[PDB]
Structure formats: C-alpha cells, structure tokens
Scaffold this motif. Structure first.
Motif, mmCIF file in Angstrom:
data_model
loop_
_atom_site.group_PDB
_atom_site.id
_atom_site.type_symbol
_atom_site.label_atom_id
_atom_site.label_comp_id
_atom_site.label_asym_id
_atom_site.label_seq_id
_atom_site.Cartn_x
_atom_site.Cartn_y
_atom_site.Cartn_z
ATOM 1 N N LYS A 34 0.820 -1.208 0.000
ATOM 2 C CA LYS A 34 0.000 0.000 0.000
ATOM 3 C C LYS A 34 0.857 1.262 0.000
ATOM 4 O O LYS A 34 1.953 1.271 0.566
ATOM 5 C CB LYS A 34 -0.903 0.002 1.230
ATOM 6 C CG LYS A 34 -2.102 -0.897 1.084
ATOM 7 C CD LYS A 34 -2.631 -1.264 2.459
ATOM 8 C CE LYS A 34 -3.663 -0.311 2.927
ATOM 9 N NZ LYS A 34 -4.054 -0.654 4.337
ATOM 10 N N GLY A 45 -3.659 -5.624 0.123
ATOM 11 C CA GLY A 45 -2.951 -4.432 -0.334
ATOM 12 C C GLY A 45 -3.614 -3.814 -1.564
ATOM 13 O O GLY A 45 -4.397 -4.477 -2.222
ATOM 14 N N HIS A 46 -3.291 -2.546 -1.859
ATOM 15 C CA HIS A 46 -3.661 -1.892 -3.137
ATOM 16 C C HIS A 46 -2.958 -2.531 -4.336
ATOM 17 O O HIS A 46 -3.569 -2.686 -5.390
ATOM 18 C CB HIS A 46 -3.309 -0.395 -3.149
ATOM 19 C CG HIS A 46 -3.842 0.381 -1.988
ATOM 20 N ND1 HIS A 46 -3.145 1.434 -1.423
ATOM 21 C CD2 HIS A 46 -4.996 0.262 -1.282
ATOM 22 C CE1 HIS A 46 -3.846 1.926 -0.414
ATOM 23 N NE2 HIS A 46 -4.972 1.235 -0.310
#
Ligand SMILES: OC[C@H]1O[C@@H](O[C@@H]2[C@@H](O)[C@H](O[C@@H]3[C@@H](O)[C@H](O[C@@H]4[C@@H](O)[C@H](O[C@@H]5[C@@H](O)[C@H](O[C@@H]6[C@@H](O)[C@H](O)O[C@H](CO)[C@H]6O)O[C@H](CO)[C@H]5O)O[C@H](CO)[C@H]4O)O[C@H](CO)[C@H]3O)O[C@H](CO)[C@H]2O)[C@H](O)[C@@H](O)[C@@H]1O
Length: 101
Positions: A34, A45-46
């Motif tokens: 992230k 996570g992104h």
C-alpha cells in the motif's frame, strides 16, 4: 533455516514502481503493498499480484502506471513458495528517495 530474501523497490522516471527478489529456487513470488497507508497484518494491499516465473534470475512485480513522489512510503509484504513451503518478508517499509531511468 530459510528466510525470504529482502525485496528491492525502485521508483521509475517518469512513472512506475518496480519490485523484485532474487530467484532462490521459488515456484511463486507475490507482492502485497500500500501507498502511504500501513498494512494491517497480512491484508491483500492496493498492489496485490502473484508472479509465476522469474525473468533473467529475478522475480519481478511492476505497476508501470504508479506515479510516485519523494517521501512516498510503501508498506508491503511478500510471499515466496520454496519447495511447496511459504515464506514472507513481513513489515516491509520503503521510502522513495529518488528515481531510476
Ligand atoms: O476456487 C475458486 C475461487 O478461487 C479464488 O482464487 C484463489 C486465490 O485466492 C488463490 O490465491 C492464493 C492465496 O490464497 C494465497 O494466500 C495465502 C493465504 O492463503 C494464507 O492465509 C492464511 C491461512 O491459510 C491460515 O489458515 C489456517 C490454516 O493454515 C490452518 O490449517 O488452520 C487454521 C485454523 O486453525 C487456519 O487459520 O490462517 C492465516 C491467518 O491466521 C492466513 O494468513 O496466508 C498466506 C500468507 O502467509 C497467503 O499468501 O497465496 C497464494 C500465493 O500468493 C495465492 O496464489 O489461488 C487459488 C489458486 O491456487 C485461487 O483458486 C477466487 O478469488 C474466487 O473468486 C474463486 O471462487
């Protein structure tokens, strides 16, 4: 006994993020990260992606579109499968300090 190798992160000029580990006989590398927000344990996570083969000796994750800035922090963890067993680099923290051409 065995520990996941530390990842190398680079911010790319004009844009991009590159993350890699050396191939230590893995079947799989995953990156979970992230931007400017802490990981709350092993969340996805992104950035979240399985890499299934190395390229010239390294396992590489890319987001060719990530526009990073000095002082940006990436909080991350990685996952590698070695001989059917899993290992992580936990509590990854990386600060952008410059860019790579
Ligand atoms: O089938 C159709 C379905 O497919 C889905 O896609 C699958 C995809 O998600 C999968 O991706 C892999 C990914 O899951 C994997 O993540 C692991 C994660 O599993 C692991 O989580 C652990 C738990 O395992 C653990 O459970 C404990 C258990 O081991 C023990 O025996 O019992 C305990 C109970 O007492 C139990 O808790 O618990 C901890 C929490 O304490 C969890 O953290 O964690 C590791 C990190 O350590 C994480 O990496 O990683 C793989 C490699 O990166 C991914 O590939 O892959 C499948 C194919 O192989 C896909 O099928 C889709 O998403 C759905 O839409 C589809 O319907």
């Amino acid at each position: 006994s065995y520990e996941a190798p530390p990842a190398t992160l680079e911010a790319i000029h004009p844009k991009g993020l590159r993350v890699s580990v050396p191939d230590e006989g893995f079947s799989l590398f995953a990156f979970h990260g992230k931007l400017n927000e802490e990981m709350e344990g092993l969340e996805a996570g992104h950035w979240s992606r399985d890499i299934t083969k190395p390229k010239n000796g390294r396992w590489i994750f890319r987001d060719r579109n990530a526009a990073l800035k000095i002082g940006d922090k990436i909080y991350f963890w990685t996952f590698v499968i070695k001989d059917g067993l899993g290992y992580r680099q936990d509590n990854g923290e990386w600060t952008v300090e410059g860019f790579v051409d």
